[PDB]
Amino acid sequence: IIRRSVANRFLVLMGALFLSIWGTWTIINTPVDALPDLSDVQVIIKTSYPGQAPQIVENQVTYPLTTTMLSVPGAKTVRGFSQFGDSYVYVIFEDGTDPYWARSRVLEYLNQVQGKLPAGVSAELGPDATGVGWIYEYALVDRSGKHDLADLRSLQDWFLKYELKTIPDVAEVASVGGVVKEYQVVIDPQRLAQYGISLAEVKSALDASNQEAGGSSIELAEAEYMVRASGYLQTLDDFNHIVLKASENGVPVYLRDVAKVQIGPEMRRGIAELNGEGEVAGGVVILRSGKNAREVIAAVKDKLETLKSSLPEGVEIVTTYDRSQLIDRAIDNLSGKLLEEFIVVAVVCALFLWHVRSALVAIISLPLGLCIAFIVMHFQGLNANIMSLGGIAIAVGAMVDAAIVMIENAHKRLEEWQHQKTRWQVITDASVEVGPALFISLLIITLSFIPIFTLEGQEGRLFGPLAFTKTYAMAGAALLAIVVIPILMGNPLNRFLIRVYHPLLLKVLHWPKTTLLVAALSVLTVLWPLNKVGGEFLPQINEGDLLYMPSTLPGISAAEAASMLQKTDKLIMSVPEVARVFGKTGKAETATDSAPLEMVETTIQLKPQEQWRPGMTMDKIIEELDNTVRLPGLANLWVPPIRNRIDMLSTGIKSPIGIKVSGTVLADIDAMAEQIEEVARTVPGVASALAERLEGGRYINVEINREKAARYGMTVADVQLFVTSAVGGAMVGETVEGIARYPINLRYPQSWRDSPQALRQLPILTPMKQQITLADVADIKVSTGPSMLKTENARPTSWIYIDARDRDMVSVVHDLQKAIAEKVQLKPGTSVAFSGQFELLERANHKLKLMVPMTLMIIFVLLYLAFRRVGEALLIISSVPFALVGGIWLLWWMGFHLSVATGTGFIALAGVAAEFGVVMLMYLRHAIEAVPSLNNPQTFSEQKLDEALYHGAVLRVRPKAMTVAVIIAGLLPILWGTGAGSEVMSRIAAPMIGGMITAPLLSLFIIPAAYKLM
Amino acid sequence: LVDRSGKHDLADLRSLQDWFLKYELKTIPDVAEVASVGGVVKEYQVVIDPQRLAQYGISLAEVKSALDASNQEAGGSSIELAEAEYMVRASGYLQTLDDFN
Amino acid sequence: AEQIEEVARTVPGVASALAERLEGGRYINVEINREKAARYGMTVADVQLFVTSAVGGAMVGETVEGIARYPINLRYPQSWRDSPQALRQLPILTPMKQQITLADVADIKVSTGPSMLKTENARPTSWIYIDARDRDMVSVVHDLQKAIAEKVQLKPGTSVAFSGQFELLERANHKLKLMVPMTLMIIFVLLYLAFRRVGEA
Amino acid sequence: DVQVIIKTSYPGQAPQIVENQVTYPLTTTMLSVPGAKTVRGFSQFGDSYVYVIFEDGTDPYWARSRVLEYLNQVQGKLPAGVSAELGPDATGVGWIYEYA
Amino acid sequence: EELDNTVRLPGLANLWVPPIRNRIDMLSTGIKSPIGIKVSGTVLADIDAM
């Protein structure tokens, strides 16, 4: 046992050095962010569909993607954002699944379908990254008015993209905003009516007139020759001279003679601004999921610096989101604090048994002891995000104790032989009478920690990292305790504490029952912060740069929304701390930004809090700010970066509930959405149901009269020709200019298309060379409709998010199914399903009451091991709840919130107080040999029981005093601040400490006082 | 699938199994596919009539040309009207037997 | 590829740079005159029809003979396609049932060009292999970046990168001086084991 | 090393043009696939060969499929027929026996 | 048996089998049989006359 480990003895130093050299290589090598990748497991499947409409972008394009994907393995959900001009469809399975499986599998059924969707409009398949995946994001700038918007985006686009994606672990690099060169032929309905050429003639001509072909080798003067055809439509000259009517031996109508070819701006879909000055186009860098955010960035900056030249003139590159930085303010946080943990331990070790040895050996031991913790992430993968790095800090605390035990019991058996090579063999023996209570106890605290960690859901994916990290920080300390033994080799206050202590031993004795009584007091007083809990649960954290994102009502135009951003972006520059701002509104040219145009985002660089305002907690910024922007129709949500991104795609329900309602047609799930909304108000559920908040958006219906098509002898389809190409500006043909190819657009001028009435008057010229007007072949009616559609499983479903805050309401949900079932109407073919973040909270509760009982079954098939008798075990167990009481109370003071952050402090707590209770239960149990050395047994008791105590009593206030000091000394530094987010490590330090003030104090009276009884 | 009354139609059934049943199951953990068998599937049938076709003068490459074309739906942009931007739509989904004839 | 070739000779690098050794190959350009297409009332595309199918012998349709299917080719005879001048004279017959000749709708110019293209990452790149045999020249490479950076011209949107079997030989040298020292750290934490004293080791 | 050959038989054409209308949607699409090592192209006359290679020693029947993701998507940005072949399964050592 | 006879129409060689079996072999293409000469080669006439 503790013998063979000391026979391997000489081996460990080499075992140890093996670990030093090794640890220092992989350490500086880890991945290292924060904010664990999840948003679960997903595969985005975009379909760029230039211009269309959400009833119809749904029908002819999303329908063969929602639908085919029911039929692929991983058949989890085929859940669809199918909007205007785009069709996004996300399939997600179960958490933690080897995605490059999850990828390909999906793929099987995407290929098959490119025939059930139209022409072009080919379906994109995700990237490779999450939403966390947007590392760095730059903007493009001009220092002179000599450079053009069009010139820029192309530059970002045909010169920048090539320059980055060539970068190890950058996946994709999506350009945002600006404007894209657009060759536009503007048909002119007068010149078109004189000369006699239909659209199916121009568009017929255009598709044809812009190619390049070759046809063989000519065997000339022996060096064989290849033959080539010219045709790349590149000179505006070559445009104007396309031929339409070809009057032989006379004039040919040229294109010039029916339309006016002008270079213009693509229909805009993602617009970007940058303070007052810049409406501009720049791009972002999405991280090829699973790779050190930091290093990618390096390779980028370095390539950018390299690149700082190849530009033209007047175009700096500004950085709007250097995710690198928030990685450093935090990494240094934990770089400093752990060296600071040393300054505190040096203090208190040095202060207690004067003239220390242990801290110096231990510090060298830890970075290596850490050099192991992350190779074991290496054995079964993880994330060095701060959650994990939350495992490393407690690690210190759980590592503090053990060096301490070897440190104190060697003080006993070093001073007894100084009252009297082999001085050494006698010191190891000391750590044998007490021994295992250190090694073992460590083990105890660790598995006692794992059962709360395994949880799955959205949140359980969110602790999964930390969870593991402790597991590995323990392995270190666990077998460290056992090997924090071999490594070491290579006054006045105690008196007053001891005197203050002999009256309570003569008073925990003076009264047996009283411990149970003062016990029912403190463990029930706890119930006042154990029910009021201050308020709120798991929120917060700190970005460096904030994301404005509002609640905008659906419809708004494209020029206003470009100014309404010029403006918003104008006044957010007001407050001085803000270093740069960036408002990209609409998609971001990546399948991650499924953002419409009324969705306005804005990255907000903030200057180091080193300067610029007296006070202003991040919450005073938000406030003042939140008011520095009070325009109408804007419900403004302000959020950090990662969060905005990560939830932005974790589709489903922030909400706790919602009645999904499926079944085959809009009328069913629309009228339904109505029929039920009322149920929420009467029933005992605080209510706010919204059948349809999406369906806002206004259309211009164009009902061709069928019959009215026949007479005119025009095929309905042919009409379309004049609704799509003629009016919107539907495009045909892409000009090609090497590497980069720009698009050619063909439609009636800026005007005839300029209003419903103007549109009733559209000038149409049928195949029977006759002149009409659209109004004449169709009823142009206005109308109101949807600006989106969600979709769970091919069919149409309306998932009505709902909540009754600050409760647990599994009860209300059960009552509703019975109630509907007794009097409500389901139309032809339809079904209802329920879901939210509730099913997730109820599944975990069900498995947590099975892992905490399972953590106690293994705890008690270990609470009894080293010492035999049950009474002791029950004693450590009535002993912890007091620790928890001192702890949890530390919370009400601050009026906290609790979480899975507190939910962990609680857990190293109950482990460590358990650890000090068992050693104090031990200083009173191995010694049936202390009992009889004094023994006067026969008439039982005496002043001898009293004196079988005050010896193990005075010994416990040297080890436990300076250990409960540092324990209370590390769980603090992180509390009163964190220039690098530590709402996390505070929220875990919270109840562990209160546990400490209360806990050591409880070590002294349980061992005497549950012992008396049992 | 079964009918307890002669009020329901074979065609009505298979579609029900097909456009309402399939959705209701494949949404089930480890059910792969759920294949419908037998019945009958609604089939819009134009029956060319070789006499009326011979009088009027329209070849098949004319009817079939016409049919492929006459059953769509297209849209072409947003109209910037009273500030709330508008989208424009084309009707054409071949749904009324009236629209067929 | 031209502008830089000279840098190799003066600098301390034994030199032989070849901007382009590939670009050998001779073409017969067929510049359709656009305008000259309209009058004749023929769509440029339609011209193509007579450059590709008519002349090379571009194929259409595959005959099928069970298991195996052979291909059907359609073009002007072995002759009319038989020489640049013969080709200036190609006989063309437009949609306006009129008779012309290619020369008449296009300038058939001869020309010289590439018989290949390499390509690193979508764009076009010219990777000019180079060497100064029988040395290790990590030193020469460093001096060149500084030198170009002080007086050379980069046109609109462009970048230069370096590579070879050198980066491979330099990465290994860097890891070999880390595995041979690591092989001795474990060797000496084993050179001393069985016998104790350092002098022996 | 580790490679995936991606041929495109293009009966007759020309390297300015066998590059433009056929190799361009294969060089280009493949920037956007994982294993984003290099999209390095021999694009000649009548053929367009494009080899993607990652890092040494990688389970290729991964390396295969991954590539594949973006080859399917593009058969519309290249012409008629001239469909794009995807390697074999062998190396260059792979030519064992050869008869006449 | 009784069943096998409750169904004696013409042209029907009736095979009666369990469910799984019917399914599992129904696709284990090849040969229930122990042997069979496969004969390949490029056209119907060869492998038909063969």
Ligand SMILES: [Ag+]
């Ligand atoms: Ag958003």
